[PDB]
Amino acid sequence: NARMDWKETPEAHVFKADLPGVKKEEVKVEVEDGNVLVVSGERTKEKEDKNDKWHRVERSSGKFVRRFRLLEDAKVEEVKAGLENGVLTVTVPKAAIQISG
Amino acid sequence: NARMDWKETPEAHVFKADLPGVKKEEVKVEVEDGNVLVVSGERTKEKEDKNDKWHRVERSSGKFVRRFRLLEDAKVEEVKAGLENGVLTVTVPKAAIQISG
Amino acid sequence: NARMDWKETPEAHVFKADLPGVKKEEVKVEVEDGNVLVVSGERTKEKEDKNDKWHRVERSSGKFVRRFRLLEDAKVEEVKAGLENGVLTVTVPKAAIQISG
Amino acid sequence: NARMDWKETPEAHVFKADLPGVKKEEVKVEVEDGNVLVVSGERTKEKEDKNDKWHRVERSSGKFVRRFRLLEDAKVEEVKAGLENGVLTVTVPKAAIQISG
Amino acid sequence: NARMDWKETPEAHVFKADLPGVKKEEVKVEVEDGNVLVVSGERTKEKEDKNDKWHRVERSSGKFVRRFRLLEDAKVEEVKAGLENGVLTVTVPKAAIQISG
Amino acid sequence: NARMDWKETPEAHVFKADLPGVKKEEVKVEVEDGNVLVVSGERTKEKEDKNDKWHRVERSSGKFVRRFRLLEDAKVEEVKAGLENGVLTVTVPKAAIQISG
Amino acid sequence: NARMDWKETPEAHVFKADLPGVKKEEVKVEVEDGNVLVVSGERTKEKEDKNDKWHRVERSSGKFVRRFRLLEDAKVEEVKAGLENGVLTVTVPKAAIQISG
Amino acid sequence: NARMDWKETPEAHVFKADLPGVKKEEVKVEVEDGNVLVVSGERTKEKEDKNDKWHRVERSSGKFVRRFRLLEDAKVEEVKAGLENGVLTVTVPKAAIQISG
Amino acid sequence: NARMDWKETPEAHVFKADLPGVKKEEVKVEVEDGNVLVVSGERTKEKEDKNDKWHRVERSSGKFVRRFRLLEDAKVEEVKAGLENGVLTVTVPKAAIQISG
Amino acid sequence: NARMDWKETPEAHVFKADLPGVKKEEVKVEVEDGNVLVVSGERTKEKEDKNDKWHRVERSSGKFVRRFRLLEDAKVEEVKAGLENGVLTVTVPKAAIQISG
Amino acid sequence: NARMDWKETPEAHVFKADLPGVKKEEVKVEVEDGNVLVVSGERTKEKEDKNDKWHRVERSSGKFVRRFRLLEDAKVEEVKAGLENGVLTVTVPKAAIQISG
Amino acid sequence: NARMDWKETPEAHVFKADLPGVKKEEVKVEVEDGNVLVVSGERTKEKEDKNDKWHRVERSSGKFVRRFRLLEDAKVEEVKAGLENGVLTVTVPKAAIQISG
């Protein structure tokens, strides 16, 4: 329910999470024990027409929690998190031989 | 792989598609052969530079194609397509036995 | 799991269902969404008392549900349903070449 | 073709067999070597309209023989066997510690 | 024993069947219930030298029957069928949304 | 995959190959390294135009290669090769104990 | 959760059960229908520091019941059961040819 | 196979091991290479005499070895080891974000 | 190494064992605990030409022991055992319902 | 399945076959096509009477066929075949580098 | 294509790589980010007789890259690498609890 | 497992074998039974001392044996064997149809 990427540019650690149709009130980005990024949530039920006929349902998301061990304790007040076009983004600012023989 | 739901309302058949990270300029919504809904586009890979370092990669990228066969009598000229929060929505407007023994 | 046969006569489509041990008060035969035959009911489990002792149990019990899509032009008001000897029967009334080259 | 249950109430041994659509002339309940209940048979071909179109056929029963070893020699004249609603029923009348160490 | 292709050019439906070493007296192309093409047959035994030694035998064809549901009732007198170079050929003559959001 | 049989007559070793839809201009019959029969060619794919529509495709196309090792003493200069009705034929001309106890 | 051994010395039947970290108030040794030894129980939750961090947990025991059919009705008042070093012990006191042809 | 848990308290890392039927004289607790906890010993097989008869054998016997890597800064001289009720315990003393974007 | 059959004629229990190339000094038929027939042995090494070339070896027999529980204690002095044509033979002399309901 | 060994002596190629329970009148030893040793026969099934009762059946019965290709120069007229103790024997009479670097 | 061993003697880290038939101009030993040994290469095509007949080819090596994380930053000028008898060798010079209870 | 190639030149059959880390004193090249090339030897394991520590082991050691059947007419007395760079080389000196239809 949350395929994620983790990239380390020289300037910061950038995490991406595919969370299509999720609202910020349903996602949570926290930091634990100084160096553990935590991403969790649960896409709400679509308050769509009760009585509709469901021909096919592939999109089936649920609760989930993910954790990553940062290489260095993060300055929590500098961590940025944005949700856009179904993608959550968490940015964490960082501080030849010769053969013969 | 674009996940899609197919629901039916009294007024129309509604299709949903998870397309996180896709801008409306990368998605195409059409009707082929007169009655085949075709949802396609590309989830562009952010190749970037070699200065970067990847610690985890789970998100997919590339081309996606989805086809549904609409009714021979569907408001093909009235199909709407909306894209918000990584979710695409296509609206296709529509034209007790008593046991013996 | 209720086993069902689907045969077609010049006059109607006939459905058969093995429902051993089911009284007609436990079976329901309907037509949903205008053209979907729905056969459902329950094969009640004879729980009994603890004085009893079971040496073998192979027979199933519980709920069963079966759906067939009838023709958009079927005598929906003329569907009959009979139950005898553990078999349910539903009657849905209906509205050479030469080689060479 | 003959899922069966065997229950032992204090009063007798009760066997059940799902034989939907079977006629008594097609089933046989015998007793062998004093303590062996034997159930066998074969559902006859439905002498239904020769020429019918078979859309779907799940109900496919054939010949079969089953045997159970009774705990005590049975009084064959007291054994009752009835067929109803596709279910064959054969009734056979019968005659803390302390831890420490 | 009869790998087949089905192509629909604007002018007609063209079926191909690999029937190597088969003679027209062994193949049959019929039409059933107005819209069902039927191809069947059985390659005859090669009346070759009785007593020959069979080192290796891969070519092992047998009886077979195939059916296709035509999109429209075919005019049986217009259906052409030819056998040549092991290939049977049956020809059947026929008669952008702008994304909001 | 070209299916081939290998039979032996008092006069010669006979090879058969199913090559439906192959013209004699697309098949090659040779003898390599002095004693290796090589049957090869191509089953050309009828690509055609985009106006067409494919409903079924089971027939293969492309290159095929088959090799058999003949006898060090075989009429290599007398090998014949015939092609008819999708079947290729290659003719390679050829140069009781009583139990005791 | 209760690997057990059953040894029959001439003097008695000896059963062993690995029940590490289990307290007698959590294990039960009973005798049913005269000749059926029954061993059951459930290791209690370690009332250890609520809040501890669990790095690795392999020891994961739960509820269980085991039964053995004694060769002879046991004198229940003579059955001894002791728990020591994680091992439950239940003691039940008991009362050539020539070839040629 | 000795099952072990690894928990961490504010004061120390605690290890547990199921060792039913093992006397403290058969268990060894050490620290190798300066920081590797090594728990090993043997669960002696009670071979006995041939007068005996085995009806069931599920309990294992033989040698067991377990290794955990402690911290380069752990009270290696303050490690305690207790054994009671078939369970070994080793005590190794120790030295939200906003979404928007 | 000893495929065996066990037949019970009214007169006796007859066991057969395929022991090709085995000599009586290599087979053993015993009786244990009054009612347990025991067949064991081991085909000796063929004292054939040391230095021979072994192209193919399928016949590969070894040690084996088999036991059967007789229905009645056998009179050991009456048990006959003969070896002939690779077959060991051990002979042990012995002493409808109505449906309706 | 008749198990056979194939050994070679300076004087001849020797074949062995396990044929327990087979009389020399049921075995046939021949040489087909001039150089193919053919060992065949039948291990007759002792059907017997219905008075009998089978408790175990592991021995096979029926036809067996074995073929070995002898040398184009083998004493085909001098092949012997012996049968004893369930084993068939067929005797087919026969017509250091120094590492540089 | 490069099975490797890594041994740590007190004096240094010794890596071995089976690179049969490889020339030093085809192998590369580098050091990255201070503590990462890297071994890569590709055995060249044997400039042997173009036209030769290949009966059997098992030796099939290709491109490859391997990396190991050294325990300590290596002094690159002290790293020795020799190729001999198909084996690459890379040498990297380095700088009881009493049970209570 | 010694990987070997078998190529044929107009002058001889050439065999190659990957034998990294094997000195010519550990390899043996012979011709058994008059026409069987036998390449064998041992890849000695460098057991060493306990002061050492192994972090990775992928290279194999032990005995290896390879056999190829040469021609009944091969220069058995002219076979050469060279060993260089972990590769062993053994040199064994050697003594269009028009399609009708």
DSSP string, J19-36: -TT--TTSEEEEEETTTE
Interface touch G81/D96, C-beta < 8 Å: no
Interface touch B82/E100, C-beta < 8 Å: yes
Q: Does I58 touch chain J (CB under 8 A)?
A: yes
User: By the 8 A CB rule, do H91 and H72 touch?
Assistant: no
The 10 Å CB-count burial string (b at 16+, else e) for D32-64 is eeeeebbbebebeeeeeeeeeeeeeeebebeee
Structure tokens at D44: 């006859």
**Phi first, then psi: what are they for H35, rounded to 5°?**
-145, 25
User: By the 8 A CB rule, do B68 and B6 touch?
Assistant: yes
Q: Does H55 touch chain G (CB under 8 A)?
A: yes
Each domain of chain E, given as residue ranges in start order, spans: 4-46+59-93
Q: Is the C-alpha dihedral spanning L27, L30, L33, L37 positive or negative?
A: positive
> What one-character DSSP code corresponds to residue B19?
-
User: By the 8 A CB rule, do A7 and B55 touch?
Assistant: yes
The span from the CA of B94 to the CA of G84, in Å, is 76
Contacts for H73 with CB less than 8 Å, ≥ 6 apart: H95
Chain E: residue nearest B26 by CA?
E99
Rounded alpha-carbon distances, angstroms, from residue I3 to C57, C96, D49, J3, J45: 35, 59, 53, 14, 15
Nearest to H84 among K96, K98, K101 (CB): K101
The span from the CA of I88 to the CA of E60, in Å, is 45
Provide Rg for chain L, Cα atoms. 19
Chain breaks of chain C after residues with C–N above 2.5 Å: 95
How do beta strands I4-8 and I80-84 pair? unpaired
Structure tokens at L100: 């009708």
Chain E: residue nearest F55 by CA?
E6
Verify I-F touch: 3 or more CB pairs within 8 A.
no
> How many CA within 13 A on the CB side of residue B10?
3
The SS3 assignment for L65 reads strand
Q: Does B98 touch chain C (CB under 8 A)?
A: yes
* Residue in E43, E50, E30, E32 with CA at minimum distance from that of residue E2: E43
Contacts for K22 with CB less than 8 Å, ≥ 6 apart: K41, K43, K61, K83, K86, K88, L85
* Partners of residue I55 in chain J, C-beta under 8 Å: 6-8, 13
User: By the 8 A CB rule, do I72 and I94 touch?
Assistant: yes
Q: Does D100 touch chain G (CB under 8 A)?
A: yes
Q: Does I10 touch chain D (CB under 8 A)?
A: no
* Beta-carbon count within 10 A of A66 CB: 14
> Tokens 């066929």 sit at which residue?
J65
The span from the CA of L20 to the CA of L1, in Å, is 11
Q: Does residue K35 come out as left (phi exceeding 0), alpha (psi in the -120 to 50 range) or beta?
A: alpha
Q: How far is H97 from chain G (nearest CA, A)?
A: 24
* Residue in J79, B30, C93, I96 with CA at minimum distance from that of residue D81: I96
User: By the 8 A CB rule, do G29 and G38 touch?
Assistant: yes
Q: How far is J33 from chain I (nearest CA, A)?
A: 22
How do beta strands H87-93 and H12-18 pair? antiparallel
Chain breaks of chain G after residues with C–N above 2.5 Å: 95
User: By the 8 A CB rule, do J41 and J64 touch?
Assistant: yes
- Given strand E64-69, what is the order of strands in its sheet? E27-32, E36-41, E64-69
How do beta strands I99-100 and D80-84 pair? parallel
Rounded alpha-carbon distances, angstroms, from residue H38 to H1, H17, H65, H71, K96: 14, 12, 7, 14, 10
Size of interface G-H (CB pairs under 8 A): 97
The SS3 assignment for F57 reads coil
Chain breaks of chain E after residues with C–N above 2.5 Å: 95
User: By the 8 A CB rule, do A36 and A68 touch?
Assistant: yes
Sequential DSSP letters for F58-95: ----EEEEEEEE--TTB-GGG-EEEEETTEEEEEEEB-
Interface touch J100/L90, C-beta < 8 Å: no
Q: Does B29 touch chain E (CB under 8 A)?
A: yes
Residue type at L61 in one-letter notation? S
Chain K: residue nearest L49 by CA?
K9
Burial class (CB in 10 A: 0-12, 13-18, 19+), J10: exposed
Q: How far is G30 from chain H (nearest CA, A)?
A: 19
Rounded alpha-carbon distances, angstroms, from residue C64 to A42, E83, E90: 33, 52, 46
Task: Write out residues 35-54 of C within 8 Å (CB-CB) of D.
Answer: 48, 51-54
User: By the 8 A CB rule, do E87 and E4 touch?
Assistant: no
Rounded alpha-carbon distances, angstroms, from residue C34 to C6, C69, C75, E13: 19, 10, 11, 35
* Residue in K20, K17, K5, K4 with CA at minimum distance from that of residue K58: K20
Provide Rg for chain H, Cα atoms. 19
The SS3 assignment for D86 reads coil
Rounded alpha-carbon distances, angstroms, from residue A4 to A1, A39, A44, A88: 10, 10, 20, 9
Sequential DSSP letters for H72-92: TTB-GGG-EEEEETTEEEEEE
Residue type at F33 in one-letter notation? D
Q: How far is H20 from chain A (nearest CA, A)?
A: 37
* Residue in B45, B42, B40, B35 with CA at minimum distance from that of residue B13: B35
The span from the CA of C23 to the CA of C85, in Å, is 10
Interface touch A18/B21, C-beta < 8 Å: yes
The span from the CA of F49 to the CA of L33, in Å, is 65
Which H helix or E strand runs over H13?
Answer: strand H12-18
* Residue in L61, L60, J93, I3 with CA at minimum distance from that of residue F97: J93
Q: Does E86 touch chain F (CB under 8 A)?
A: yes
* Partners of residue K8 in chain H, C-beta under 8 Å: none
Across the strands, what pairs with G15? G6, G90
CA angle at residue B87 from B86 to B92, to 5 degrees? Answer: 150
Across the strands, what pairs with F16? F5, F89
Provide Rg for chain B, Cα atoms. 19
CA angle at residue B82 from B79 to B87, to 5 degrees? Answer: 125
Which H helix or E strand runs over E85?
Answer: none
> Tokens 């004085």 sit at which residue?
C51
The span from the CA of C2 to the CA of C41, in Å, is 10
* Partners of residue E71 in chain B, C-beta under 8 Å: none
The span from the CA of E89 to the CA of C98, in Å, is 12
Structure tokens at J95: 């017509």
Interface touch G21/H55, C-beta < 8 Å: no
Interface touch I76/G97, C-beta < 8 Å: yes
The span from the CA of E67 to the CA of E87, in Å, is 17
> Tokens 């739901």 sit at which residue?
B5
The SS3 assignment for C78 reads helix
Burial class (CB in 10 A: 0-12, 13-18, 19+), C90: buried
Answer yes or no: CATH 3.40.50.300 is held by domain G4-47+59-93. no
Long-range contacts of A37-44 (CB under 8 A, 24+ apart): A37/A67, A37/A68, A37/A70, A37/A74, A37/A90, A37/A92, A38/A65, A38/A66, A38/A67, A39/A2, A39/A4, A39/A15, A39/A65, A39/A66, A39/A67, A39/A88, A39/A90, A40/A64, A40/A65, A40/A66, A41/A2, A43/A1, A43/A19
Mutate one of F97, F98, F100 to test the J interface: name it (highest J CB count within 10 A). Answer: F97
* Residue in A101, A97, A81, A93 with CA at minimum distance from that of residue A39: A81
The span from the CA of B34 to the CA of B21, in Å, is 30
CA angle at residue B26 from B22 to B32, to 5 degrees? Answer: 120
> What one-character DSSP code corresponds to residue D57?
-
The span from the CA of K60 to the CA of L16, in Å, is 12
Class of domain E4-46+59-93: mainly beta
Q: How far is B38 from chain A (nearest CA, A)?
A: 16
Structure tokens at G74: 């046991």
* Residue in L83, L74, L93 with CA at minimum distance from that of residue L36: L74
Chain F: residue nearest L98 by CA?
F81
Rounded alpha-carbon distances, angstroms, from residue C68 to B13, C10, C26, C30, K64: 22, 19, 20, 11, 59
Q: How far is D76 from chain I (nearest CA, A)?
A: 8
* Partners of residue E59 in chain F, C-beta under 8 Å: 3-5, 16, 18
> Tokens 């439950």 sit at which residue?
G88
- Given strand D36-41, what is the order of strands in its sheet? D27-32, D36-41, D64-69
Distance of CA J62 to the CA centre of its chain: 15
Burial class (CB in 10 A: 0-12, 13-18, 19+), K3: middle
Q: Does L80 touch chain J (CB under 8 A)?
A: yes
* Partners of residue H101 in chain A, C-beta under 8 Å: 80-84, 89
* Beta-carbon count within 10 A of G98 CB: 11
> Tokens 């209906």 sit at which residue?
C94
Interface touch A101/K79, C-beta < 8 Å: no
Distance of CA G51 to the CA centre of its chain: 33
Burial class (CB in 10 A: 0-12, 13-18, 19+), C1: exposed
Sequential DSSP letters for chain K: ---EEEEE-SSEEEEEEE-TT--GGGEEEEEETTTEEEEEE-PPP----TT-EEEE-------EEEEEE-SS---GGG-EEEEETTEEEEEEE---B--B-
**Phi first, then psi: what are they for H89, rounded to 5°?**
-130, 125
* Residue in C77, C63, C83 with CA at minimum distance from that of residue C17: C83
Contacts for B33 with CB less than 8 Å, ≥ 6 apart: none
* Beta-carbon count within 10 A of J21 CB: 19
> What one-character DSSP code corresponds to residue L19?
-
Provide Rg for chain D, Cα atoms. 19
Q: Does F98 touch chain E (CB under 8 A)?
A: no
* Partners of residue E96 in chain B, C-beta under 8 Å: 28-30
CATH topology of domain F4-93: Immunoglobulin-like (2.60.40)
* Partners of residue J18 in chain I, C-beta under 8 Å: 18, 20-21, 59, 86
Long-range contacts of H81-84 (CB under 8 A, 24+ apart): H81/H29, H81/K97, H81/K98, H81/K99, H81/K100, H82/K99, H82/K100, H82/K101, H83/H19, H83/H22, H83/H24, H83/H27, H83/K99, H83/K100, H83/K101, H84/K101
> How many CA within 13 A on the CB side of residue I55?
14
Sequential DSSP letters for G21-39: T--GGGEEEEEETTTEEEE
- Given strand G64-69, what is the order of strands in its sheet? G27-32, G36-41, G64-69
Interface touch J81/F97, C-beta < 8 Å: yes
The span from the CA of B89 to the CA of B18, in Å, is 9
Sequential DSSP letters for C12-37: EEEEEEE-TT--TTSEEEEEETTTEE
Rounded alpha-carbon distances, angstroms, from residue B8 to B2, G37, H6: 20, 61, 53
* Residue in C42, C18, C61 with CA at minimum distance from that of residue D1: C18
Neighbours of chain G (3+ CB pairs under 8 A): D, H, I
Nearest to K84 among A97, A98, A101 (CB): A101
Q: Does E10 touch chain B (CB under 8 A)?
A: no
User: By the 8 A CB rule, do L52 and K8 touch?
Assistant: yes
Q: What totals of helices (H) and strands (E) does chain I contain, helices first?
A: 0, 9
Verify A-J touch: 3 or more CB pairs within 8 A.
no
Q: How far is G81 from chain D (nearest CA, A)?
A: 5
User: By the 8 A CB rule, do D16 and D87 touch?
Assistant: yes
Interface touch C82/B101, C-beta < 8 Å: yes
Contacts for E71 with CB less than 8 Å, ≥ 6 apart: E8, E13, E35, E94
Chain breaks of chain F after residues with C–N above 2.5 Å: 95
Interface touch E100/B79, C-beta < 8 Å: no
Q: Does E3 touch chain F (CB under 8 A)?
A: yes
* Partners of residue J21 in chain I, C-beta under 8 Å: 16, 18, 85-87
The 10 Å CB-count burial string (b at 16+, else e) for H28-63 is bbebeeeeebebebebeeeeeeeeeeeeeeebeeee
Interface touch H100/A88, C-beta < 8 Å: no
* Beta-carbon count within 10 A of G32 CB: 9
Q: How was this structure determined?
A: cryo-EM
Interface touch G97/I31, C-beta < 8 Å: yes
Size of interface D-G (CB pairs under 8 A): 28
> How many CA within 13 A on the CB side of residue F98?
1
The span from the CA of D52 to the CA of C7, in Å, is 7
Contacts for K45 with CB less than 8 Å, ≥ 6 apart: none
Chain C: residue nearest D89 by CA?
C21
The 10 Å CB-count burial string (b at 16+, else e) for G85-96 is bbbbbbbbeeee
Which H helix or E strand runs over B58?
Answer: none
* Residue in F16, F54, F24 with CA at minimum distance from that of residue E4: F54
Mutate one of D49, D85, D88 to test the C interface: name it (highest C CB count within 10 A). Answer: D85
Interface touch F29/L96, C-beta < 8 Å: yes
